[model samples]
Target: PLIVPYNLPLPGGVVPRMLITILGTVKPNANRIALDFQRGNDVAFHFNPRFNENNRRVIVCNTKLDNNWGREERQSVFPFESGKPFKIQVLVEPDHFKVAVNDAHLLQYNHRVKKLNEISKLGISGDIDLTSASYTMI
Candidate 1:
């Protein structure tokens, strides 16, 4: 179980309409994809999608805490294509972060780290090919 930052226990955390869903498949060693929505280590909404088609077709929205990695938000509207099969939906509004892919509407990421239920934890890593990852709240 190589759970890359997959530390979740949000039974009563991340309020204000929270819903996390990631059922995936996109690989071949990888082209780069990340989904970091943590709290303990403080990484509120860092959805990275680097589809490699040259200089990396970009989609990086950032936020990290003590170690720092802010002020670097980007998105080029690349709908992730490598080995296909992808569906990521993260919507937690209190200020922002309403992203969707394979289901369209992919861009929001605003609330830098405003104590949105302290998030709990749910981080994902690159090189894609994760079958299922689920978190629920309406």
Candidate 2:
């Protein structure tokens, strides 16, 4: 399991250096991914191979978490090809999720859960392999 600091609140709306630990083999629809936050139930995201293009797949979160307050302005970092080992730092501030990849690239994911207090977990699933993960709450 990835060891991340618990009980830490996002100082701002961004993705920081939080290492994510992907344990075991990620089977199709069989495994589940989740992030255990400090306060509420963990939120889970899934990876779909059907969405993969040029070895890149769109990582989507569960809409049940929220309506994505920033859906109208949603944008993703591009050219994430397969077999390419990339890293992302999810900085959770007050209203948004900022994703920093490889400590250089940045991507933004809007809030899916309306109530930030209800978001305390993060998860991932789908056809992918996760060796290990860890992150800093910067």
Candidate 3:
């Protein structure tokens, strides 16, 4: 995992325009991958790529309110292959987060936290073999 839970600090913090790029390879028997943008304990965005989680080939995007979760957003496009390297990009907008995988648009997550500057931490985990990650605030 390139991100250590709440230990990742976004460069210049999150703003109207920001970018997070994560490049890695999925484990041979990967179950899922979760990347989150956080504000304190609040999850501003949740990007979950579930590769056959109980045979569900989908990506689930959501937000967290307290210990509970909000409605889930999903897409049928699965560009990541097991045991293969992949690239994921998250573009932060004033109202939403645009996500892309392997240079293809995948999903858009509407902002739930309201304040983009409050989202200062990044969390990444799950069945992935990370190579490196980069953060850019534009």
Candidate 4:
């Protein structure tokens, strides 16, 4: 089965010092990608990278609760490129998540939902060919 829009269970849930990694290749004509940390119907973290927003590259991060989205956090220094392979690493901290792309520090999103362990699922979707996704304690 195709793996786009895949939802993986977090057996141990999200905890401090946890690291999640995704290796993938951006589609040649890709526009956007989304990686989310979720709890039931709520999205604790929404990490989105867009290549065609306003014809500019950027990354948007936010949280969603009760079917409503919170204020978006954005960054203009995008690291993913169309038709190129990239590695994404999200490290969990007590107060925020530290993200890195292609081995370079990217950005961090603070905790919107503080009960991290309740976030038991990771959802990934977008215009990219996923190679692998895994998590480990650091």
Candidate 5:
């Protein structure tokens, strides 16, 4: 099994007009997965995908501040599949993060933690093999 629940300190953090790219593949029997941009113990953005939730598939996005979770933004479109590779990009804008999958626009999550540079950690976990992860400041 691939080592999971990994966290990396994002050097220089994120900037306006930046791009955070994650390349990975879902497991053949995958159920759930998550990626997070965090500052200290607070989560600026949380990206979660569930393969099965009461026979429904959805991608859930949210923010956590002071241990409290915000409303979940559930996207009903399923862009991932078992045993397939995927390219996910989170483009940091002034007010929100625009997310894309396989180079197509997927969803956008607004900044809950307003300071982009304060989000200094990248977290990955659950049901996938992460091949590569990187961020570009532009």
Candidate 6:
């Protein structure tokens, strides 16, 4: 797993882009996932099984954000299993994150982050293999 550090402030209504590469096997029930500098009742968007099918990639929004827990809303989209090397670009906007996998599919999530300047960490985990991971603030 690759971990990236971001110090930029992700306001409540702005979007940022993240580029991640899968390197290991992504397992089910594993909570070792990715997150940004989140505080208070902020929101975040990403792809996870807790919100949708495990085999398909679904965009989810985490509301009621704090330091340790959050709630999520799942978006409807087809699940994608990338067996080979691929790229996923995640757009973190003020209200949600727009994710594009290999430039083939798109998923969006409505996320709100608390303490607009509290975003500073990015975590990556799962059963899927990852080669590299990087993120940029937009």
Candidate 2 local lDDT, residue 129:
52
Off by over 4 Å in 4: none
User: Could you tell me every candidate's TM-score relative to the true structure?
Assistant: 0.33, 0.49, 0.90, 0.97, 0.94, 0.55
lDDT of model 1 at position 96: 94
Q: What lDDT score belongs to each candidate, Candidate 1 first?
A: 0.78, 0.40, 0.83, 0.92, 0.88, 0.47
Q: Model 2, 35-137: lDDT tens per residue?
A: 3332233342222223344444444433432323122332344433444444545565555565555566455545555555444454443344554554454
Error of 1 at 99 (Å): 21
Of the candidates numbered 2 and 6, which has the greater lDDT value?
Answer: 6
Write the residue-wise lDDT of candidate 6 on 15-111 in tens digits: 3444333333344443333433344334343355332356545545464444444666665553444344446666655555566666765666655
The C-alpha stretches of model 3 lying farther than 4 A from their native spots are 1-6
Look at candidate 5 and tell me the lDDT of residue 109.
88
Per-residue alpha-carbon lDDT of model 1 for 20-104, expressed as tens digits?
8887777764668888877877787788888764766888789889868888788898887778888888878778979888889
Give the RMSD in angstroms, all C-alphas superposed, for model 4: 1.1
lDDT of 6: 0.47
Q: lDDT at 3 for candidate 4?
A: 87
Per-residue lDDT over 35-116 for candidate 4, one digit per residue giving the tens place of the 0 to 100 score: 9999888999999999998899999999999999999999998989999999999999988999999999999999999889
Q: lDDT per residue, candidate 5, 33-110, as tens digits?
A: 899899889999999999999988899999999999999999998899989999889998888989999998999988
Q: Provide the lDDT at 35 for model 2.
A: 33
Q: Which stretches of candidate 5 lie over 4 Å from their true place?
A: none
lDDT of residue 91 for candidate 2: 62
- Our tally of clashes for model 6 stands at 29
**Candidate 2, overall lDDT?**
0.40
| Clash tally, candidates in order | 0, 29, 0, 0, 0, 29
TM-score of 3: 0.90
